[PDB]
Design a binder for this molecule. Structure first.
Ligand SMILES: CCCCCCCCCCCCCC(=O)SCCNC(=O)CCNC(=O)[C@@H](O)C(C)(C)COP(=O)(O)O
Ligand SMILES: Nc1nc2c(ncn2[C@H]2C[C@H](O)[C@@H](COP(=O)(O)OP(=O)(O)OP(=O)(O)O)O2)c(=O)[nH]1
Lengths: 117, 151, 115, 368
C-alpha cells in the first residue's frame, strides 16, 4: 500500500511520512519553547502543531491522515512543517514580540495625498 | 536558543565580516539637508537655469467650485515655444514645461526643492479668510443705502 | 540637523572615499579594454581625461549617501563596460560628440536666441 | 541517510560483505566481486568534529548506533606504544636515549616545549592516516558507512596551533606541510562533517568536567590556544571542507541530544549533487563506471603499503626530527629486542603463540 505518484513534479513520495512529520513537529516545539509566553505567535504555533501532532498520532493510515488534517497531501504537509521550522528558527533572531521599531511619520498613509487639511 | 543546525555563513565568517554586517545594520547620523541633483539624472543646465514656482493654482473665475484650489503645486518656468515650419504646431524644447507636481503644504514643496536642488520661490502664501456677514434682511432696509433695487 | 538612517555600504566618509578611489582604479584598468574593443574615435588619453572630468564634476558633493549612490551607479557603468552590454553610440555619450557648443557671453546669447 | 526508525528496523545489507581483513582484494579479484553492488544511502563517511572537550566520543557512538554505522574513535598513541600483545613500550625509557624516549599526550601536556612533541604531531597525523584507509576499507568493501571522531584533514590546525603558541619552529611546520602535500591528495574527502561549536571558555569548563590530572595541571589549555583552534577551524578548515562535504554546525554548550542531530541528516538531499558531473560537492566519491569503483577499492585495499610508504620523505635540515645514529642503533637494540616485538606479531614464541612450525600466513595490510 503506497502512492504511485503525487501528481505533482519535484516531490517524490515519502517512505515514512509519520516519523518525518513527528520529528518536524517536535523540532517546532523545541524552537517555540524558547519564545516568551506573552508572545501570541508562540501560542498560535503551539496550538497548530499540537493539533497536527494529535492528527498524526491518532491516524496510522496515510490517506486517512491527509483527510483528517484536510490541508493537502502528506508531502505538502512535510513541506509546510519544514517551512514553519525555518520560520520558528528565524523568529527567535528577528524578535517580533516587542513594540514598534519605527513610529508613523506625518501624512505617510493618507490617501488622497495632495490635500491641505 | 534553538539546538538545531547553525547558519554556516555567520559562524564561519571572519570577525571583520561580523563587524561589517553589524555596522550596516545600525543607524548613522546624517544631516537632513541633502542635495540630490547628481542622483536625479537631471542635466546641469536645467539645474542652474530653471526657476521653480511653488503656488496654489488660480481658481477659474467662471466657476464657483474650489476643489482644484485645495492643493499646492510646483511648476517650472515657461521657456520659448515656436511654430515648426512644416505644418504649424507648437514645438517646444522645454522638457520640464509640462510638469505640475502636487503637494500639501508649501514647506513640503520647499523641502522637496531643497532635496532636488532646484532654485525655488513661492509666488503667494495661503489666502486668509475674511469673515463677511451675509443675510437676507439687509436687502430690504430702512434709511439705508444698501436697499436693493432688483427683484 | 540630525537624522538616523540606514547606511549604504559605508558608515563614514573614509570608506566612501576608498570606494570612489576603487572606482577610479577599476575605470583606469577598464579604459584600454574599452578603447580597443568598442570601435570609438577616442584616444586612451582622451578617455582618461574624460574620466577625470566625470570625477571632477562630482567632487563637489559632501553627503556620504549621495557619494555611495554615485559609487553604485559608477559600478553599474563599469559592469556594463567589462561585459560589453552596450554599443559605441552609448560610450561616446559622455563626450557629447554631436551637440554643438553654445556661447556663454551675453551678446552672442542675445544675437542667437532666447535660451 | 536514513536512520533506524524510518527504515523500520536494523539495516539490511544490499549484498554479502567482503572479508577485507582476511581475503586480499586485488586486480584479479575485481572480476568476480564488484564494489558498487553493496552501496546504498547509508554508505557514507561522517566525521564528527570539534574542540578539545566537546563530548565527541559519546555523541559519535550514539550516532553510530542510531544510523547503523561503524564507530571509529580518535587514534591515540597507545596503538603503537602498546603492541598487539599488550606490552606497553613506555617502560623502555631508562634504556632508551633521551632523544628516543616515549612521548605521548600526557608528555605533551606536562612538557609542551619539548622537541619530540613536533614529532608527536607528525606521528598523530600518520595515525589518523592509519585509520582513514581503515575507514575507506570499510565503506567500499562492506557497504556500511563509518563515523570518525577526528580526521586526517583535521590535524593541520593542531600543527598551526602549536606553531602560533611557539611550541614548533618554522622547520617542523615546513616538514609537516610537505608531508601533508605529499599524502593528503590520495584520500577521498568525507561525505558529511558535524562540527560541535563551543566558546573558548566553556571548553575549559568542560576540562573541569573531565577532572583528569594531566589536563588540569598543564599549561597548554589556555585562552589563546583554544581561541587559536577555534579560529583555525572556523576560518580555514571548515571553509575548505564545505566545498565538498555537507557541513552541520551545532551549538553544544548544553548536553544535547543525538536524535535531533540524526533527524537533521535525512532532511539533506544527497541526490542533488549528482545532476552535474563536475560538481565540487561529492566530487571524490562519484564514479561513472563499476570499474572505477573497483579501481578505487583496489587503491584503498591493495595499496595501503603504497600510501604508508608515501610518508618516506627526506628532511634533514631540522634538528628536532633527525635521530642520532648511535641513538638509533641503541633504540633498535632496545625496542626490537623487547618482548612482543622481536618478530612479526603473528610469529612470536615469547608471548605464547603455538603451532609456529606449520604456519605460513601473514596479515593483509599489517605493520611489520
Ligand atoms: C572611457 C569612458 C569614461 C567614462 C567616465 C565615466 C565614469 C563614471 C563617472 C562616475 O562614476 S561619477 C561618480 C564618481 N563618484 C564621486 O565623485 C564620489 C564623490 N567624489 C569625491 O568625493 C572626490 O572628492 C574623490 C573622487 C574622493 C576626489 O577627492 P580627493 O581630493 O580625496
Ligand atoms: N598535541 C596534540 N594534542 C592533541 C591532538 N589531537 C588531540 N589532542 C589532545 C588534546 C587534549 O589533551 C585531548 C582531547 O582529545 P579530543 O579533542 O580528540 O577529544 P577527547 O579525547 O577529549 O574526547 P571527547 O571530545 O571528550 O569525547 O587530545 C593533536 O593533534 N596534537
Amino acid at each position: 500500500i503506497i502512492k504511485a505518484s503525487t501528481g505533482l513534479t519535484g516531490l517524490a513520495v515519502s517512505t515514512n511520512p509519520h516519523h518525518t512529520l513527528s520529528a518536524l513537529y517536535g523540532k517546532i516545539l523545541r524552537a517555540v519553547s524558547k519564545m516568551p509566553q506573552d508572545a501570541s505567535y508562540r501560542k498560535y504555533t503551539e496550538q497548530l502543531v499540537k493539533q497536527r501532532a494529535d492528527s498524526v498520532a491518532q491516524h496510522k493510515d496515510i490517506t486517512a491522515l491527509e483527510k483528517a488534517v484536510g490541508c493537502g497531501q502528506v508531502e505538502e504537509l512535510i513541506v509546510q512543517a519544514e517551512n514553519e521550522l525555518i520560520l520558528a528558527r528565524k523568529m527567535l533572531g528577528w524578535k517580533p514580540w516587542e513594540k514598534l521599531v519605527q513610529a508613523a511619520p506625518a501624512k505617510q498613509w493618507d490617501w488622497p495625498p495632495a490635500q491641505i487639511m | 536558543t534553538d539546538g538545531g543546525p547553525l547558519d554556516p555563513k555567520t559562524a564561519l565568517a571572519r570577525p571583520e565580516e561580523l563587524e561589517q554586517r553589524n555596522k550596516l545594520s545600525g543607524k548613522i547620523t546624517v544631516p537632513t539637508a541633502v542635495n540630490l541633483s547628481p542622483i536625479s539624472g537631471v542635466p546641469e543646465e536645467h539645474i542652474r537655469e530653471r526657476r521653480v514656482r511653488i503656488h496654489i493654482p488660480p481658481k477659474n473665475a467662471m466657476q464657483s467650485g474650489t476643489d482644484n484650489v485645495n492643493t499646492w503645486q510646483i511648476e517650472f518656468d515657461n521657456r520659448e515655444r515656436w511654430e515648426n515650419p512644416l505644418m504649424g504646431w507648437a514645438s517646444s524644447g522645454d522638457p520640464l514645461s509640462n510638469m505640475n507636481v502636487q503637494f500639501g503644504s508649501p514647506e513640503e514643496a520647499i523641502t522637496f526643492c531643497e532635496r532636488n536642488g532646484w532654485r525655488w520661490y513661492v509666488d503667494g502664501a495661503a489666502k486668509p479668510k475674511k469673515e463677511r456677514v451675509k443675510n437676507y434682511g439687509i436687502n430690504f432696509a430702512w434709511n439705508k443705502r444698501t436697499r436693493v433695487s432688483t427683484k | 540637523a540630525v537624522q538616523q538612517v540606514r547606511p549604504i555600504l559605508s558608515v563614514d566618509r573614509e570608506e566612501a572615499r576608498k570606494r570612489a578611489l576603487n572606482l577610479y582604479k577599476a575605470w583606469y584598468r577598464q579604459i584600454p579594454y574599452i578603447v580597443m574593443d568598442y570601435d570609438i574615435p577616442m584616444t586612451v588619453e582622451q578617455c582618461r581625461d574624460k574620466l577625470r572630468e566625470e570625477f571632477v564634476k562630482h567632487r563637489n558633493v559632501t553627503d556620504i549617501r549621495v557619494i555611495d549612490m554615485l559609487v553604485i551607479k559608477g559600478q553599474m557603468e563599469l559592469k556594463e563596460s567589462v561585459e560589453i552590454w552596450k554599443q559605441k553610440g552609448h560610450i561616446m555619450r559622455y563626450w557629447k560628440e554631436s551637440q554643438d557648443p553654445k556661447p556663454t557671453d551675453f551678446l552672442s546669447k542675445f544675437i542667437q536666441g532666447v535660451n | 541517510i536514513s536512520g533506524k526508525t524510518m527504515r523500520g528496523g536494523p539495516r539490511v545489507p544490499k549484498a554479502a560483505p567482503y572479508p577485507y581483513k582476511t581475503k586480499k582484494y586485488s586486480v584479479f579479484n575485481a572480476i568476480f566481486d564488484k564494489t558498487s553492488k553493496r552501496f546504498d544511502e547509508n554508505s557514507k563517511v561522517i566525521c564528527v568534529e570539534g574542540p578539545i572537550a566537546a563530548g565527541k566520543s559519546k555523541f559519535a557512538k550514539e550516532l553510530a548506533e542510531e544510523l547503523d554505522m561503524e564507530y571509529y574513535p580518535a587514534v591515540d598513541l597507545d596503538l603503537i606504544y602498546i603492541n598487539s600483545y599488550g606490552y606497553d613500550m613506555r617502560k623502555l625509557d631508562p634504556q632508551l636515549p633521551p632523544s628516543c624516549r616515549s612521548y605521548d599526550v600526557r608528555n605533551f601536556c606536562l612538557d609542551p616545549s619539548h622537541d619530540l612533541a613536533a614529532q608527536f604531531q607528525i606521528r598523530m597525523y600518520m595515525l589518523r592516516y592509519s585509520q582513514y584507509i581503515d575507514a575507506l576499507q570499510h565503506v567500499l568493501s562492506t557497504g556500511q558507512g563509518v563515523v570518525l571522531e577526528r580526521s586526517p584533514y583535521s590535524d593541520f590546525v593542531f600543527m598551526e596551533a602549536m606553531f602560533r603558541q611557539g611550541y614548533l619552529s618554522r622547520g617542523a611546520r615546513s616538514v609537516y606541510n610537505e608531508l601533508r602535500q605529499n599524502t593528503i591528495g590520495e584520500l577521498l574527502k568525507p561525505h558529511l562533517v558535524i562540527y560541535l561549536d563551543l566558546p573558548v571558555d566553556a571548553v575549559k569548563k568542560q576540562i573541569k568536567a573531565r577532572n583528569v590530572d594531566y589536563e588540569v595541571q598543564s599549561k597548554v589549555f589556555s585562552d589563546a590556544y583554544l581561541s587559536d583552534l577555534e579560529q583555525l577551524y572556523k576560518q580555514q578548515y571548515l571553509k575548505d571542507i564545505s566545498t565538498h562535504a555537507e557541513l552541520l554546525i551545532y551549538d553544544w554548550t548544553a548536553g544535547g541530544e543525538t536524535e535531533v542531530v540524526v533527524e537533521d541528516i535525512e532532511r539533506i538531499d544527497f541526490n542533488q549533487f549528482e545532476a552535474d558531473i563536475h560538481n565540487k560537492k561529492m566530487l571524490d566519491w562519484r564514479f561513472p563506471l563499476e570499474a572505477e569503483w573497483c579501481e578505487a577499492r583496489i587503491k584503498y585495499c591493495h595499496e595501503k603499503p603504497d600510501l604508508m610508504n608515501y610518508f618516506n620523505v627526506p628532511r634533514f635540515d631540522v634538528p628536532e626530527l633527525v635521530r642520532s645514529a648511535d641513538d638509533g642503533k641503541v633504540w633498535r637494540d632496545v625496542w626490537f629486542n623487547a618482548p612482543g616485538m622481536k618478530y612479526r606479531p603473528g610469529y612470536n614464541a615469547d608471548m605464547g603463540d603455538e603451532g609456529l612450525l606449520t604456519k605460513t600466513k601473514i596479515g593483509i595490510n599489517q605493520g611489520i
